[PDB]
Amino acid sequence: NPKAFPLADAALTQQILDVVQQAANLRQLKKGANEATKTLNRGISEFIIMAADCEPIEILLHLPLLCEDKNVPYVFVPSRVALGRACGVSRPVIAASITTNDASAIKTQIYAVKDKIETLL
Amino acid sequence: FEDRFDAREHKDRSNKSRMQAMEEYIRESSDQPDWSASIGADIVNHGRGGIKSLRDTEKERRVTSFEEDNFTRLNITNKAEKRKQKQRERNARMNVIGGEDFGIFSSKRKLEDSTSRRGAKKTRSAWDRAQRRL
Amino acid sequence: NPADKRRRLAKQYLENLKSEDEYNNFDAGDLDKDIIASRLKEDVAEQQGRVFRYFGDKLLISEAKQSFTRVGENNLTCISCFQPVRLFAYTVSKDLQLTKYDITDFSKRPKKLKYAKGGAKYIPTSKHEYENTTEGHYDEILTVAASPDGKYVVTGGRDRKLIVWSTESLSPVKVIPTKDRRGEVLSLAFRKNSDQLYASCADFKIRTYSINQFSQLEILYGHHDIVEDISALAMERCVTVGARDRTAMLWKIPDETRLTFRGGDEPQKLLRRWMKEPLFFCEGSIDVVSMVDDFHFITGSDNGNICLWSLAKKKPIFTERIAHGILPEPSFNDISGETDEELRKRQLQGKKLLQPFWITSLYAIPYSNVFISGSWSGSLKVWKISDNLRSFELLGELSGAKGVVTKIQVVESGKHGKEKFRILASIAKEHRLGRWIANVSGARNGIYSAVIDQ
Amino acid sequence: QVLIDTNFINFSIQKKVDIVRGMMDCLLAKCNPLITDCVMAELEKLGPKYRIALKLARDPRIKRLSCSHKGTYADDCLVHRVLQHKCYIVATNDAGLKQRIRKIPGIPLMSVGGHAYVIEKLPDVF
Amino acid sequence: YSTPKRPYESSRLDAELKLAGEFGLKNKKEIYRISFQLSKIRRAARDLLTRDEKDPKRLFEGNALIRRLVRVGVLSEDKKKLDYVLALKVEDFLERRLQTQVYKLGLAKSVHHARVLITQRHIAVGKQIVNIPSFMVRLDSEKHIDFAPTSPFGGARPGRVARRNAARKAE
Amino acid sequence: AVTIRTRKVISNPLLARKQFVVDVLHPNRANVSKDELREKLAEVYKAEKDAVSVFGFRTQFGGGKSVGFGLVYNSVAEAKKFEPTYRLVRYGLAEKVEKASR
Amino acid sequence: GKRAINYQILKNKGLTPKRNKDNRNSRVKKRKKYQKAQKKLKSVRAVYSGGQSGVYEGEKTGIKKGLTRSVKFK
RNA sequence: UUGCCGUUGCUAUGGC
Ligand SMILES: [Zn+2]
């Protein structure tokens, strides 16, 4: 067991990154570590994606404890660069969060990814 | 007795057996692409009609090919249009949901009777089926 | 066996549809249409041109004259060139400057001629999407394209404009906005020997223009992510690739129809294929194209794939999995923050977070036997496609280009059996769309020219 | 998921309707039929005249619940476990049980009528 | 379309109340039309289940039905089984119409703002301006629903109210 | 600014003619503007403006494109010979009215 | 000199009751009887409104220590 | 050979 433990393999990683890109287009993604912990303590979050290769790792390992407290799925993508590119911004991000919405046109996709990463976790 | 020239037996029919489930499976397992339109270009009356079905866009492509090929507009011929356009658009808004026709699932027509279960290669001998395999 | 029964019943079905080689084999409608074919005109643009320049193994590779002319522009982004039937080149940067070069002095480095630098002065005084008719670029010029006849260069970027500049003076003759808020252009390609431009805009849109008439022909829709690259030849076909939908489409632009080609490599079946006796996996995002001829093209992916596709097969014909290597893993003094090397090594998880270089530039020489791939591995790769057109293979490398390769294209010289080319490649230290790129390992913002011979 | 009782089974066999296939072409959905232990106790107590009904209720396609109470009053058990949870269709032909079930709200009621099953308080049947 | 069996029971009235209010429908005929053709769809899929495995009808019409249901978009890509066609229902069908989709994509503030945008022609999927609200967008036309370029909520010239107010304030 | 595209250009020596299909492109314009289209056609081809002609115009839904049928002649006299009289009334010079009785 | 007809002879809506502006549109009526219905639903059930908005202020309406609104079994 | 700056060559490199 490493610190960044529940890492996803390549198929789950690309499923995660595709729904991250679609939520970023639909304004349902809060990107960055402290925005992610803000939306996590506010409770509007469906799952959090941490990238398992940033330059420290505890910098985002603070978030699994918060997700565990509030029972939110969390998953580790192995590329901060690809995560930022999926988020649609011109920088690497290390953590992102899918906020809850019921007037959301990708709710089935988000729920399927939640089920996959929760059976992983 | 004697022969008699039969265009109904050397005419290309190919439509008694053209079933949409078999054709859809062939389009799935075709391994060559399918010439689909740029996505807005195939809806018809700002959405007052359907999208258009695959048979309707095939027929439209045939009509525009014949159109450009011999320089003639087709017409508003009354008997054929009062049959075909009105009956076609009413069964289109009946059975075509979102560019896909679901009319076939509501229709009794046996697949394997006409379109499968070969009649010429019926292999009514043990030896003929043995040679057809090997 | 249900799929066996499906294949069997489909075979019987096709046999029955045939039911409903002799000495005489002539068909009346086919020969009548062939009489009309003998009657018609314009066997010029619509050549279904196959690969007629078979010269991959012929020319030299290993001793190219490689000059990396460094320029003082932050993050060069595109390269456009020109040959008539003196040669000029064009570069453009993230510093909002277009720069004209002369390149025809073949044995030496290119020569700067003229700047054209937009800036904050060109921000429109409206913030209104159809009075975007200013005369310069105020944000992030992403692509240039020279005319095949050479009257104009046409460029555009994230300011959702197409500015067409004259060649002889680098002056903006005409401005055409893309009339909506997300309408950033990402790739431009003229169809060859023409005046028709194909721009690929991030609205999932492809705009087409006639430049010498200052008119837009046709807008054509249908990708699912941003159309990251475009490619065209002398035919009125076009080939675009959207980024994350992992499909490449090719467009009959007069018919406004397309052929889609999805990817579809899975590490489950691929690791089973290796398990019959290994760090290779699925696909991120198809990124770059170049139409090699009018029946084949090649795609550069996000997991370092280079794939070769035909016009008659949905799934790709040939793959090449790792094309520029896998990236150097982040150091133990920059992963963890513990004290001991054992825990800082445990924070690498072995091989699980090694990511491959992604091919960010691909150029097929038109109708030829050889294409060039580039990323930030430092070394361009040159590949030739086999003469049966079902595979390609690495010839050699061009290792004098430190940085990301934001653009590759070649410039021809020499006659039908003796040839020499200069491969231009725009080199930056940052990807041409966003930043995202750490470990800038000795990169410089320059133009890597190579002179290859024979 | 549909809770069966004894007169629904008797009327099914008297009208020659299969249980799971009658349920499927009534609702046009996939059904899970449930025999509570009190309905099974009632069918067993019906005697050796109803052997056909008992060994058609003994069917692996018909799943079965485990009621935890004294006595075998299936109407009380069905009413209690349906007004507790509201995730059940009640298939019945008793007039009294039909009136109880259609007086408690949100509970669809299925019944043998004619030569196939009918459903009433389920508002999405077509 | 066709009317239901018992059209006036209170569960059906509260059902239609929730459906018309949650999807901005004008009357009962929207629900009844889309439910009539859904009834045909899953009445067919019931017969495709009542025949057996390796039946030609079941194999070919089953994968045909689930593939064109996936391409309409009411069925996701991974559930390629034929019992999910039975689990399908009416709001899975009228979440696919253009009014619902315009509101979910966020070009409008409610389903009623979406209905008036569609009927005032500010919405175009792909190339063509769609102008009826019950359109049943597909899984490929899901991402090209945007504002029409002929409309002031796109980038076009502003309408008559805005330009008349600008002219009168210029006077 | 209108835009012009010729396709499938064949030659008819029996009718001394060159014929083709005409994709006419008018983004944010109404329609083909047929006399201006004959001008644009007569200048993209050679001069013969009273020998170029178009007849079959169909605009697709939402505007922009329209497909017409273009036929261009050499020799305006033989164009007057070969074209029909109603199209000559529409475009060129001929005008003979029918006798209105019964 | 043209004695034009007027609206009550033209449209002939003889002696109607006062009717509703919300009844003049079939869509707005169901918009406003669904808003009424989902305001009545807050009375019968307790509706999940979306969780804790800001700081937890308190119950804002009272706490009953005698009432138990839970479904007992059998 | 450039935005600066260093080695420079009497041309190539490397730090922002
Ligand atoms: Zn019981």
XYZ file of C-alpha atoms in Angstrom, chain G residues 21-68:
48
model
C -55.348 34.427 -17.376
C -53.633 31.206 -16.303
C -56.375 29.287 -18.074
C -55.665 31.195 -21.277
C -52.448 29.124 -21.624
C -52.417 25.381 -21.124
C -48.702 25.371 -20.297
C -48.648 28.140 -17.683
C -51.548 26.508 -15.841
C -49.591 23.301 -15.357
C -46.552 25.366 -14.411
C -48.560 26.987 -11.620
C -50.450 23.928 -10.431
C -47.175 22.039 -10.150
C -45.653 24.861 -8.115
C -48.726 24.639 -5.910
C -48.366 20.863 -5.684
C -44.719 20.933 -4.726
C -45.485 23.589 -2.127
C -48.108 21.251 -0.678
C -45.590 18.413 -0.701
C -43.508 20.276 1.877
C -46.532 20.049 4.179
C -47.185 16.312 3.989
C -43.650 14.893 3.847
C -40.412 16.540 4.814
C -38.624 17.344 1.578
C -34.858 17.117 1.140
C -34.114 20.703 0.197
C -30.436 20.242 -0.596
C -28.566 19.925 2.688
C -26.910 22.436 4.964
C -26.751 25.838 3.292
C -24.399 27.846 5.489
C -23.592 27.659 9.169
C -25.958 25.379 11.055
C -28.201 27.973 12.652
C -30.613 25.601 14.324
C -33.918 23.999 13.617
C -35.558 27.407 12.946
C -39.059 26.075 13.566
C -39.006 24.071 16.798
C -38.144 20.647 18.194
C -40.912 18.428 19.540
C -39.713 15.977 22.142
C -43.025 14.119 22.298
C -43.757 13.423 18.656
C -42.074 10.474 16.931
